Scaffold this motif. Structure first.
Motif, short mmCIF file in Angstrom:
data_model
loop_
_atom_site.label_atom_id
_atom_site.label_comp_id
_atom_site.label_asym_id
_atom_site.label_seq_id
_atom_site.Cartn_x
_atom_site.Cartn_y
_atom_site.Cartn_z
N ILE A 7 0.88 -1.26 0.20
CA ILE A 7 0.08 0.02 0.16
C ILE A 7 0.91 1.20 -0.15
O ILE A 7 0.50 2.18 -0.69
CB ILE A 7 -0.94 0.13 1.20
CG1 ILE A 7 -2.12 -0.89 1.32
CG2 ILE A 7 -1.71 1.28 1.35
CD1 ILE A 7 -2.79 -1.46 2.47
N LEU A 11 -0.78 8.15 7.15
CA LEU A 11 -1.19 6.49 7.28
C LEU A 11 -2.48 6.21 7.50
O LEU A 11 -3.00 5.21 6.98
CB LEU A 11 -0.41 6.34 8.52
CG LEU A 11 0.98 5.78 8.37
CD1 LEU A 11 1.64 5.37 9.82
CD2 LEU A 11 1.04 4.65 7.43
N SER A 12 -3.41 7.25 8.01
CA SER A 12 -4.81 7.11 8.10
C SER A 12 -5.42 7.11 6.71
O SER A 12 -6.37 6.31 6.41
CB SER A 12 -5.51 8.11 8.91
OG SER A 12 -5.02 8.08 10.30
N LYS A 55 -3.88 6.29 4.02
CA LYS A 55 -3.40 4.99 3.23
C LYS A 55 -4.13 3.85 3.66
O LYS A 55 -3.94 2.86 3.31
CB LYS A 55 -2.02 5.09 2.96
CG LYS A 55 -1.47 6.02 1.85
CD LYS A 55 -2.15 5.75 0.44
CE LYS A 55 -1.21 5.82 -0.26
NZ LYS A 55 -1.17 7.43 -0.93
N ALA A 56 -4.68 4.01 5.12
CA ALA A 56 -4.92 2.66 5.70
C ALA A 56 -6.39 2.13 5.44
O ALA A 56 -6.97 1.25 5.92
CB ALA A 56 -4.94 2.92 7.23
N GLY A 70 -9.47 0.24 3.89
CA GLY A 70 -9.42 -1.11 3.21
C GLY A 70 -9.41 -2.11 4.01
O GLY A 70 -9.72 -1.99 5.27
N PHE A 109 -7.64 -6.62 4.10
CA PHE A 109 -6.84 -7.52 3.21
C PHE A 109 -7.52 -9.10 3.52
O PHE A 109 -8.55 -9.12 4.18
CB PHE A 109 -5.44 -7.89 4.32
CG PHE A 109 -4.62 -6.88 4.07
CD1 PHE A 109 -3.73 -6.54 3.14
CD2 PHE A 109 -4.41 -5.82 5.19
CE1 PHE A 109 -2.71 -5.34 3.26
CE2 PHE A 109 -3.61 -4.74 5.49
CZ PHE A 109 -2.64 -4.75 4.37
#
Lengths: 48, 49, 48, 48, 155, 155, 49
Positions: F47, F128-129, F131-132, F134, F136
């Motif tokens: 990511i 980070l928030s 991009k975080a 979603g 897995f």
């Protein structure tokens, strides 16, 4: 197969009696070495 | 289909040594031997001409 | 209609149960390729 | 056993037909040779 | 066992550069104490290994050193205080007409509350929190290898 | 490993442009410390990759540098204080006849609380928030490819 | 209906190689062979005029 070789001795087909299981198609016969389909191959996974 | 072809291709000849090793389990032995022992136990009689 | 209805049931049987977990995804994306490895190991060795 | 069908008839037939094979295979050779040797020792000419 | 290097420690934390006030014997003793809060054994399979473990040990040693050196010379009488000086996070302060109020960290047990005392402890807690994501699967066997799936595979 | 460019770093933050006050060896050491917090391995399947990853690493380095600054010359008396300067978000402050109150950030563990100390940490947390979002899904096989659906499509 | 037409048209010839490979499976072989084996079991008699 018209002849079978057993420990260096050649035997004609007519002298022998050979019994086979299910008959594979011609193209698949060389893979099975001109023999029938074994039952263990068809039963081992289910038995386990 | 591709997954179907792969699934059907997966099954194949395993080997004589593999068959011999598989042939020690009791279930396989029973399955392959009961019919053989039952078929030819009554016997047969001979007729000449 | 009959064939599609017959075919539908095994497809749902194939995905009867789904499992999910929660986690602080920020730390997960901070350094993955090890978090992923640990969970892949768990999935590979998963049993009762 | 609990929950299993109590017909029993086919199982008795199968058990008897298995018992026949035991007499055919295990007991016949030993007892045959025993009678042969006893006839030879006790000078009984008629075969049994 | 990780060998303590005083040169690297002094390079990392210049506030401990003075060799007279901070003899190497005290630093070695505090490292020997800190190797018990956190295991000094290292293996490649561990979550914390190598330089992360080195940084964690150094931060813990610095935290212990600061907490210890607070007592002996605090009250301008050689720590004549009966009960010593207590640690902890300072959420507010006032000196004359200057006032500051800060945010209380989320401490839930003795370990985190103690770590919040000094900046080295806070950094150690942050590093542990980052490295603590996920979990362990300890027991189990590869049972799925015995069945055929999708494209006639056993993986 | 990712190569650390001191020239680009100093270009990004002009407040660190002085080489005499901030030697390049100090910056390299802090980058080597920060690469332990966040893995620097770059792959197209992560990511965080490329410019985003470099930005996170540089922001973490700046955060660590400022944190060290508040200790090395925040007190400015050679760090002669008791336990060292403590970091954290300042919810309220008052100097003379001026008072200011701010909103408390939503910190839930040590990582976010430690990050919220400095503006660089806040920026890193925000990135980070973003991009975080979603999730897995790791274990799985295309089980659905073996059945005929709708218009005779196995897809 | 386009979807019905596509669904009914998708089924078709697969190939002799595909048939030969699929024939290896035990259940398909059993289904293909049981009727043929049972049909020619009781035999026949030769009647002339």
């Amino acid at each position: 197969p018209d002849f079978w070789i057993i420990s260096g001795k050649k035997y004609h087909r007519s002298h022998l009696v050979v019994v086979r299981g299910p008959q594979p198609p011609d193209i698949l016969k060389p893979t099975y070495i001109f023999g029938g389909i074994p039952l263990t191959q068809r039963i081992y996974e289910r038995v386990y | 289909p591709t997954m179907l072809q792969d699934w059907y291709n997966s099954q194949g000849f395993i080997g004589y040594q593999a068959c011999a090793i598989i042939s020690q389990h009791w279930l396989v032995d029973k399955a392959c031997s009961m019919s053989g022992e039952d078929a030819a136990r009554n016997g047969w009689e001979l007729k000449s001409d | 209609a009959a064939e599609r209805t017959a075919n539908e049931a095994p497809l749902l049987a194939m995905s009867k149960r789904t499992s999910t977990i929660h986690v602080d995804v920020e730390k997960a994306i901070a350094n993955e390729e090890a978090f992923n490895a640990r969970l892949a190991f768990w999935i590979a060795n998963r049993d009762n | 056993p609990k929950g299993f069908n109590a017909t029993g008839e086919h199982e008795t037939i199968s058990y008897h037909e298995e018992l026949e094979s035991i007499q055919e295979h295990i007991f016949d050779p030993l007892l045959e040779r025993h009678y042969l040797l006893l006839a030879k020792s006790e000078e009984i000419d008629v075969q049994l | 066992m990780v060998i303590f290097d005083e040169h690297k420690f002094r390079t990392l934390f210049p506030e401990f550069a003075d060799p007279a006030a901070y003899p190497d014997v005290r630093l070695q003793m505090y490292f020997d104490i800190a190797c018990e809060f956190i295991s000094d054994r290292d293996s490649p399979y561990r979550i914390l290994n190598g330089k992360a473990l080195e940084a964690c040990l150094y931060l813990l040693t610095a935290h212990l050193l600061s907490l210890s050196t607070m007592q002996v010379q605090g009250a301008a009488g050689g720590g004549v205080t009966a009960g010593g000086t207590q640690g902890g996070f300072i959420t507010s302060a006032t000196v004359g007409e200057v006032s500051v109020a800060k945010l209380a960290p989320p401490a839930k047990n003795g370990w985190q509350w103690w770590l919040s005392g000094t900046p080295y402890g806070q950094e150690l807690w942050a590093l542990l929190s980052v490295k603590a994501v996920g979990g362990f699967y300890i027991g189990g066997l590869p049972e799925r290898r015995g069945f055929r799936k999708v494209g006639g595979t056993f993986w």
